[PDB]
Each structure stands twice: as structure tokens, then as C-alpha cells.
Design an enzyme around this catalytic site. Structure first.
Site, PDB file in Angstrom:
ATOM      1  N   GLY B  25       4.102  -6.165   7.241  1.00  0.00           N
ATOM      2  CA  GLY B  25       4.483  -5.385   6.090  1.00  0.00           C
ATOM      3  C   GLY B  25       5.299  -4.174   6.481  1.00  0.00           C
ATOM      4  O   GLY B  25       6.144  -4.252   7.374  1.00  0.00           O
ATOM      5  N   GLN B  90      -8.795  -4.865   6.834  1.00  0.00           N
ATOM      6  CA  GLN B  90      -8.858  -4.949   8.291  1.00  0.00           C
ATOM      7  C   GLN B  90     -10.228  -5.409   8.788  1.00  0.00           C
ATOM      8  O   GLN B  90     -10.309  -6.183   9.745  1.00  0.00           O
ATOM      9  CB  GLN B  90      -8.518  -3.593   8.901  1.00  0.00           C
ATOM     10  CG  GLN B  90      -7.073  -3.223   8.804  1.00  0.00           C
ATOM     11  CD  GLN B  90      -6.782  -1.857   9.438  1.00  0.00           C
ATOM     12  OE1 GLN B  90      -7.676  -1.214  10.014  1.00  0.00           O
ATOM     13  NE2 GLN B  90      -5.531  -1.398   9.309  1.00  0.00           N
ATOM     14  N   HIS B 112      -3.634   3.863  11.657  1.00  0.00           N
ATOM     15  CA  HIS B 112      -4.418   4.733  10.780  1.00  0.00           C
ATOM     16  C   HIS B 112      -5.876   4.583  11.187  1.00  0.00           C
ATOM     17  O   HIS B 112      -6.300   3.492  11.584  1.00  0.00           O
ATOM     18  CB  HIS B 112      -4.221   4.380   9.294  1.00  0.00           C
ATOM     19  CG  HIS B 112      -5.064   5.189   8.354  1.00  0.00           C
ATOM     20  ND1 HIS B 112      -5.125   6.567   8.392  1.00  0.00           N
ATOM     21  CD2 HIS B 112      -5.864   4.808   7.328  1.00  0.00           C
ATOM     22  CE1 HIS B 112      -5.938   6.998   7.445  1.00  0.00           C
ATOM     23  NE2 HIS B 112      -6.390   5.951   6.777  1.00  0.00           N
ATOM     24  N   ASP B 195      -5.352  12.861   6.651  1.00  0.00           N
ATOM     25  CA  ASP B 195      -4.663  11.885   5.803  1.00  0.00           C
ATOM     26  C   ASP B 195      -5.309  11.779   4.419  1.00  0.00           C
ATOM     27  O   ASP B 195      -4.622  11.840   3.385  1.00  0.00           O
ATOM     28  CB  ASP B 195      -4.667  10.519   6.494  1.00  0.00           C
ATOM     29  CG  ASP B 195      -3.841   9.502   5.760  1.00  0.00           C
ATOM     30  OD1 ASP B 195      -4.366   8.862   4.837  1.00  0.00           O
ATOM     31  OD2 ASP B 195      -2.663   9.339   6.095  1.00  0.00           O
TER      32      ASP B 195
HETATM   33  N1  LIG Z   1       3.008   2.024   4.936  1.00  0.00           N
HETATM   34  C1  LIG Z   1       3.254   3.193   5.739  1.00  0.00           C
HETATM   35  O1  LIG Z   1       4.345   3.696   5.759  1.00  0.00           O
HETATM   36  C2  LIG Z   1       2.105   3.760   6.614  1.00  0.00           C
HETATM   37  C3  LIG Z   1       0.914   2.824   6.933  1.00  0.00           C
HETATM   38  N2  LIG Z   1       0.060   3.080   8.077  1.00  0.00           N
HETATM   39  C4  LIG Z   1      -1.055   2.216   8.353  1.00  0.00           C
HETATM   40  O2  LIG Z   1      -0.385   0.825   8.798  1.00  0.00           O
HETATM   41  C5  LIG Z   1      -1.294  -0.104   8.633  1.00  0.00           C
HETATM   42  C6  LIG Z   1      -0.632  -1.273   7.842  1.00  0.00           C
HETATM   43  O3  LIG Z   1      -0.218  -0.692   6.688  1.00  0.00           O
HETATM   44  P1  LIG Z   1       1.082  -1.262   5.851  1.00  0.00           P
HETATM   45  O4  LIG Z   1       2.189  -1.782   6.788  1.00  0.00           O
HETATM   46  O5  LIG Z   1       1.581  -0.176   4.953  1.00  0.00           O
HETATM   47  O6  LIG Z   1       0.480  -2.510   4.956  1.00  0.00           O
HETATM   48  P2  LIG Z   1       1.435  -3.553   4.070  1.00  0.00           P
HETATM   49  O7  LIG Z   1       0.640  -3.700   2.750  1.00  0.00           O
HETATM   50  O8  LIG Z   1       2.834  -3.024   4.000  1.00  0.00           O
HETATM   51  O9  LIG Z   1       1.487  -4.963   4.902  1.00  0.00           O
HETATM   52  C7  LIG Z   1       0.265  -5.608   5.055  1.00  0.00           C
HETATM   53  C8  LIG Z   1       0.499  -6.811   6.013  1.00  0.00           C
HETATM   54  O10 LIG Z   1      -0.691  -7.353   6.240  1.00  0.00           O
HETATM   55  C9  LIG Z   1      -0.554  -8.882   5.817  1.00  0.00           C
HETATM   56  N3  LIG Z   1      -1.839  -9.387   5.362  1.00  0.00           N
HETATM   57  C10 LIG Z   1      -2.290  -9.131   4.146  1.00  0.00           C
HETATM   58  N4  LIG Z   1      -3.454  -9.756   4.011  1.00  0.00           N
HETATM   59  C11 LIG Z   1      -3.719 -10.376   5.166  1.00  0.00           C
HETATM   60  C12 LIG Z   1      -4.794 -11.144   5.555  1.00  0.00           C
HETATM   61  N5  LIG Z   1      -5.970 -11.524   4.850  1.00  0.00           N
HETATM   62  N6  LIG Z   1      -4.819 -11.667   6.754  1.00  0.00           N
HETATM   63  C13 LIG Z   1      -3.804 -11.455   7.641  1.00  0.00           C
HETATM   64  N7  LIG Z   1      -2.749 -10.698   7.252  1.00  0.00           N
HETATM   65  C14 LIG Z   1      -2.721 -10.167   6.007  1.00  0.00           C
HETATM   66  C15 LIG Z   1       0.278  -8.818   4.809  1.00  0.00           C
HETATM   67  O11 LIG Z   1       0.887 -10.122   4.537  1.00  0.00           O
HETATM   68  C16 LIG Z   1       1.382  -7.859   5.324  1.00  0.00           C
HETATM   69  O12 LIG Z   1       2.069  -8.617   6.246  1.00  0.00           O
HETATM   70  C17 LIG Z   1      -2.442   0.564   7.812  1.00  0.00           C
HETATM   71  O13 LIG Z   1      -3.457   0.870   8.659  1.00  0.00           O
HETATM   72  C18 LIG Z   1      -1.750   1.839   7.289  1.00  0.00           C
HETATM   73  O14 LIG Z   1      -2.724   2.874   6.890  1.00  0.00           O
HETATM   74  C19 LIG Z   1       0.352   4.186   8.967  1.00  0.00           C
HETATM   75  C20 LIG Z   1       1.620   5.012   8.777  1.00  0.00           C
HETATM   76  C21 LIG Z   1       2.356   5.021   7.429  1.00  0.00           C
HETATM   77 MG   LIG Z   2      -0.261  10.225   6.078  1.00  0.00          MG
HETATM   78 MG   LIG Z   3      -3.841   7.104   3.654  1.00  0.00          MG
END
Ligand SMILES: NC(=O)C1=CN([C@@H]2O[C@H](COP(=O)(O)OP(=O)(O)OC[C@H]3O[C@@H](n4cnc5c(N)ncnc54)[C@H](O)[C@@H]3O)[C@@H](O)[C@H]2O)C=CC1
Ligand SMILES: [Mg+2]
Ligand SMILES: [Mg+2]
Ligand SMILES: NC(=O)C1=CN([C@@H]2O[C@H](COP(=O)(O)OP(=O)(O)OC[C@H]3O[C@@H](n4cnc5c(N)ncnc54)[C@H](O)[C@@H]3O)[C@@H](O)[C@H]2O)C=CC1
Ligand SMILES: [Mg+2]
Ligand SMILES: [Mg+2]
Lengths: 332, 332
Positions: B25, B90, B112, B195
Site C-alpha cells: 500500500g 497486523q 509504526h 502519533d
Molecule cells: N500511510 C502512511 O503514509 C504512513 C503509514 N505508516 C505505517 O505503515 C504501515 C502500513 O500502513 P499503510 O501503507 O498506510 O497501509 P495501506 O492501507 O496503504 O496498505 C495496506 C497493505 O496491506 C495489504 N493487506 C491488506 N490486508 C491484508 C491481509 N489480510 N493480508 C496481507 N496483506 C494485506 C493491503 O493489500 C495493502 O497492500 C502501518 O503500520 C502504518 O501505521 C507509517 C508512516 C506513514
Molecule cells: Mg504520524
Molecule cells: Mg497513526
């Protein structure tokens, strides 16, 4: 809400007249250039070139193909005078360089109604007074007109003397390009009071102190100021860009579920009924003239509160840590 | 702040190691592509294609030139496993697809800290546990890496079983471009708590309810909702963009003197010592585990508070007027 679009403003009503655009600042350089490529006779009222600024601005007016006159000369020239100088200076500039040169049927125009609404400028009753306030900054007023798309605007008329004050400012709205997107009918009172309230309670006062209170909370609890800067300030732009684009709903849809849940349950704990009662009090000071009085008195004694609170803000730790961290991101 | 740069990280410590990025993602796609471009051995752990979304994501990995694998196969291939699926997913993914395949000396990474910090994922003591948390959304993590600049990040180490946890995390941060811009040392606790606090009190909860309370104040006093939208929501972006680039000081320099004076004197009336005391209570609920418990219980019974409050928000007048007005501004 009453909307006015293209098919409501006749640009021919201004054929054979001159428009004086006093000032060439953010709105001045945008609006005057808009009326020139709309087929209207425009003169740009400025000060006589005396130092470096008044020369550089005078030269740029020439470079864009418009005619600069001293404020008294552009005001004697035109029958429609639009004041775009800074709000805190409008009373002196009107009194000296504009007021003695008004005739019957002349139409006086603003883009923010503080001075008319709070009695700091009182034109003669034989003079049309209108406002066209665009909802976009100067560079977006000018850049979007060159792209055939308007920015929405607010229209207001304060005194209808020639019987055609609304149509006359409506004409000015099309001349700068706001009638393309659509224009909202407002009053000087509403535009002035909502502008001050928004600035005070949300856009400037509310958000800066929300940011600072959050940062202070973290720093006083022992977290690193660099971390607090990211989580209480830097990350705000991404969030507000989404609200801007698609409302609160787009933002809540785009952040993590934990953030949305936190938003929905804690937001109203932070901005609560006590906060809403204080916003009402703040609004009442705007409606009853006491804020305007306070501001005006503050300017008359050399701005001691404004300088003291400004300096206090510049000394805040969030400004110090912010400069250090922003260096690391030259791409801002 | 302890800061790490490219000179403090050795990408060669990952030679011969396979990194599994679980998820693709916002952060997964950027981090995986970055690690690939840095010459590291990457596999992307995904659900096997089962529908339009998972087929498209799998094909995106292939289209980017990377290797997709089912999550359990990705775990079995890798010695460093970066978990980048949503935080509320997760624990289950870890339990079902990752935990059974961990070996002594593996490294488990996060961007995170919630799930490690609040005990929802408890890795074996034989596994290194680190975090590299970029301070930008994924599309900027990727874009800035392409342009040879980084995005700043945070680094934390939760468990050092091999003695090389920090060096592994620093190598990972260099691989995704964060040490290019600079990486700040923190802990899982500090990253998680700050956060949650920022989201709740400032970025999402604080600012959305500040906006809504300002809008409601104006509408209840009889002003036009379209006007309240512009003054309480629409032009917040211009203000915040300025705070983002150059701090509160740049914004105050850029607004009119009336707005700055209104900001300095009314801001602390809206966000006052009661507001700051409520921010301390909100932080206390984050620090003592009770917010985390509340969130996790909410998720266990099908999100009824989250769904009810979200819907009430979606019915608010500011979202109805906002939709109408934003449609008049196609450039959004
Ligand atoms: N989005 C951001 O800009 C920020 C996010 N984070 C942290 O990054 C980590 C990921 O967050 P995001 O990229 O934003 O999430 P996202 O919602 O953008 O992507 C989620 C990914 O996980 C996949 N996925 C979903 N369900 C699944 C499942 N049951 N089994 C296997 N894969 C699955 C999804 O298909 C997608 O590929 C989190 O811990 C978040 O807190 C940290 C810095 C900033
Ligand atoms: Mg933040
Ligand atoms: Mg947060
Ligand atoms: N900044 C914005 O985008 C918005 C401003 N307005 C309103 O329009 C009016 C002008 O706004 P801005 O474009 O920001 O003004 P500005 O601060 O950018 O510049 C005003 C112009 O008047 C000139 N000037 C300054 N002092 C003068 C003096 N003593 N005598 C003659 N000329 C002088 C300046 O050289 C400048 O060209 C204000 O009332 C404002 O509230 C309306 C919509 C939004
Ligand atoms: Mg405004
Ligand atoms: Mg203002």
C-alpha cells in the site's frame, strides 16, 4: 443562497468608462490585469516613485501593459475606484488622495468591507459603494483567469445611489473573472464579520494555538521537541489538503482507522461546549464593534500589544525546532 | 536529538539477506521499490489474487519489476520482514502467516509502533525488532528517493537479540532513503504515543472539531452556510501551507495585520488552559493503555461507535454545503 453567473453581468455597461485600481499588491496586480484583458479601460493608482519599492512596482505596472497614475490622478481620471491598498492604511489614502475627487454617479469598490462597515470610511451619499471579494489569493485570481475558469466570489453593495449599484459591481465581477465560477450575494456586514471571526477562531488564532498547545503538551511530558514538531505541525498539511479537496469525509477516509476513531471520539473533547461558548463571545465582540475599537486604538498608540505578543510568539520553541527540521527538507 | 545519516548506515550488512515487505500500500509500495533500487534483495508478501483488488496489487508488483509472493512464502524466504499491512490487521497476519516461520537471528521491522508497544504482537526473544517510521506519506517516500533526496524518518529498536538490531534498522533506513534526509532516534513508546496524541488532539480530532465549531457558530448566528464554509474550512489550506513551509512566523508575516492581531489575542482565548488540561488527560489515556484498550474492544464488537459517529459526521451541513461549493471549483 443567491448565485450570479455569466448570464447575469453585462460587461457592456462599462463601455466608455475608466476604472481606477488603487494599489498593485496581491489583489491589485491580479485584478487590474484581469480588467485590462477583459476590454475595460483601467488606470492603476500608485504613489509617486520616491524609493526602491514605489519604483519597482511602478515599473512592473508598465511591464504588464497598464498605465500608472498617482492615486489622486487615477482617482480624478476614473468614475469607478476600487481600493486595494492595505486595510490599516485605507482611511488615510481615501481621505487624502481619493475623497476630494468624487463626483455623483461614481462607484467606490472594495474587496474587504472592514473600513466601510466600521465607519472608518464614510463616502458621500451620492456615491455608489460596492464590494467584490474573491475566494482565492491574488496569484490564484490572476492565474485562473488566464485559464478561462473563474474563482468563486462574494458580491456586496453598501449604497445604491445611481439605482444600478448591484449591476455596476456585478459588471466588475465579470471583469476580474468571478462570475464564471459563480458569485454569492453577501453584505458588507456579513463579509466583514465572518472574515474576522474565521481569522480569529479557526484559521489563524485557533489553529496556531491548537498546534502550540499540542506541542507544549508533548514537550512538557518529556517527549523530544523534534518528534512533537512532526506530530503537531508538519503532518497537519497533508490532513488539511484532504479536507480542502473533499471535505472532512475524504480526510477521514484517507487516514488510518485508528486515527479516524481517535478524531471522532477526541475532537469534541478538545473543542467542547466551553470552546463553542467562547467562539460565541468572540463573535459578539466582532458584531458589537468592540473588537474593531480595540484594533483601532491599538494602532493609535504604536501597536504595543501587537509587538509584544508577536515577539513572544517568535521566541517559542516550536519556531526554533521548526527552523532546524525544515532545513532538512529543502523541498518544502 | 540523535541524528543518523547515510554515513552511519552500511547497506553491506544486508548482503546475502532477503527482505520481505509485507503489504504494498502507501508505505509498502514505496519502501519495497526503494529497497529494490538500492540493490537489495526484496520480495513482496501479498494475499494470493482472489478478487479485483488483490489481482491488481499482485500485477502492480510485477509491473514495478519486483517479485510478489504469498505472505507465508515471503516470510520463509526472508531474514528481514517489514510488516506494512494496516495496523488493525497486523496481529492476525503476523499470527497466521509470519510468526511460525521466524528463525533465530531474523529481524522484524515496523513503520509504526502501536502493535509492539501495546503488546498485540509479541515476537520471540531470539528475533531482532526494529522500526523505521518515515515522516512522509508513501508517495513522497518514493518520489523523494527517486530525486536523490530522502524523507526524514524515526528509528527505534525494541529488541536487540543479535547485537545488530540498530545496524540492521539503520541499513534498512538507508535502503529506503531516510538516512539521506536524516533519521531521528526514538523508541517504540515515544513514536506510538506522540502519533496517537497528535492525531487526536491536533491533526484530525482537534482541527476537524475546531472547523466544525467555527462553522456552527456562524450558521447558528444567521450567516450564510456557503460563507461559513469559505471562512472556516476552505481557506485554512492557504494558512496551513504557510505554517508548513516556514512556521507560524511565516504565516503571520503573510496575512494582514488585522488577522495577525486577531490571531495573537484571540487564539489563546479559544485554546485556553482548560483545553491544555484536557490535552493532558487525553495524553494520559494514551500513556496508561486505556485508549488502546478502548480501540481494541471497539474493533472486537464490529465498530459500532466508529460507525455511528462517522455517519453523524457525514450528515453535517458543512459536508453538504462543501460538496456543492467544491463542485463549483473544478480545479479540485
Ligand atoms: N500511510 C502512511 O503514509 C504512513 C503509514 N505508516 C505505517 O505503515 C504501515 C502500513 O500502513 P499503510 O501503507 O498506510 O497501509 P495501506 O492501507 O496503504 O496498505 C495496506 C497493505 O496491506 C495489504 N493487506 C491488506 N490486508 C491484508 C491481509 N489480510 N493480508 C496481507 N496483506 C494485506 C493491503 O493489500 C495493502 O497492500 C502501518 O503500520 C502504518 O501505521 C507509517 C508512516 C506513514
Ligand atoms: Mg504520524
Ligand atoms: Mg497513526
Ligand atoms: N490577500 C488576499 O488575497 C485578499 C485581500 N482582500 C482585500 O483587498 C485589499 C488589498 O489586499 P492585498 O492585495 O493583499 O494588499 P497588499 O498588502 O498586497 O498591497 C496593497 C497595495 O497598495 C500599495 N500601497 C501600500 N501603501 C500605500 C499607500 N499609503 N498609498 C498608496 N498605495 C499604497 C501597495 O504598494 C500595494 O501595491 C484588502 O482590503 C484585503 O482585505 C480581498 C480578498 C483576499
Ligand atoms: Mg477570508
Ligand atoms: Mg482579513
Amino acid at each position: 443562497a443567491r448565485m450570479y453567473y455569466d448570464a447575469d453581468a453585462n460587461l457592456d455597461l462599462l463601455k466608455g468608462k475608466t476604472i481606477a485600481v488603487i494599489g498593485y499588491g496581491s489583489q491589485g496586480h491580479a485584478q487590474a490585469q484581469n480588467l485590462h484583458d477583459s476590454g475595460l479601460e483601467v488606470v492603476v493608482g500608485l504613489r509617486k516613485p520616491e524609493d526602491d519599492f514605489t519604483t519597482a512596482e511602478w515599473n512592473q505596472v508598465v511591464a504588464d501593459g497598464l498605465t500608472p497614475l498617482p492615486v489622486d490622478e487615477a482617482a480624478r481620471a476614473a468614475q469607478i475606484i476600487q481600493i486595494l491598498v492595505p486595510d490599516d492604511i485605507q482611511a488615510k489614502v481615501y481621505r487624502e488622495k481619493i475623497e476630494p475627487y468624487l463626483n455623483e454617479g461614481d462607484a467606490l469598490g472594495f474587496s474587504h468591507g472592514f473600513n466601510i462597515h466600521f465607519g472608518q470610511i464614510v463616502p458621500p451619499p451620492s456615491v455608489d459603494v460596492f464590494m467584490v471579494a474573491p475566494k482565492s489569493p491574488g496569484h490564484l485570481v490572476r492565474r485562473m483567469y488566464r485559464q478561462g475558469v473563474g474563482v468563486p466570489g462574494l458580491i456586496a453593495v453598501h449604497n445604491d445611489h445611481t439605482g444600478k449599484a448591484l449591476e455596476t459591481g456585478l459588471a466588475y465581477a465579470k471583469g476580474i473573472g468571478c462570475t464564471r465560477a459563480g458569485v454569492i450575494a453577501t453584505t458588507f456586514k456579513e463579509e466583514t464579520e465572518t472574515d474576522l471571526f474565521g481569522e480569529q477562531c479557526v484559521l489563524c488564532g485557533g489553529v496556531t494555538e491548537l498546534i502550540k498547545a499540542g506541542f507544549d503538551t508533548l514537550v512538557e511530558a518529556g517527549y523530544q521537541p523534534e518528534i512533537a514538531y512532526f506530530e503537531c505541525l508538519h503532518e497537519l498539511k497533508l490532513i488539511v489538503d484532504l479536507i480542502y479537496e473533499g471535505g472532512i469525509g475524504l480526510m477521514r477516509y484517507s487516514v488510518s482507522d485508528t486515527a479516524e476513531y481517535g478524531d471522532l471520539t477526541v475532537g469534541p473533547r478538545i473543542i467542547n461546549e466551553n470552546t463553542r461558548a467562547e467562539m460565541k463571545k468572540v463573535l459578539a465582540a466582532i458584531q458589537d464593534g468592540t473588537f474593531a475599537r480595540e484594533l483601532l486604538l491599538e494602532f493609535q498608540v504604536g501597536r504595543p500589544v501587537f509587538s509584544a505578543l508577536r515577539r513572544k510568539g517568535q521566541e517559542h520553541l516550536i519556531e526554533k525546532v521548526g527552523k532546524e527540521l525544515r532545513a532538512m527538507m529543502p523541498w518544502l
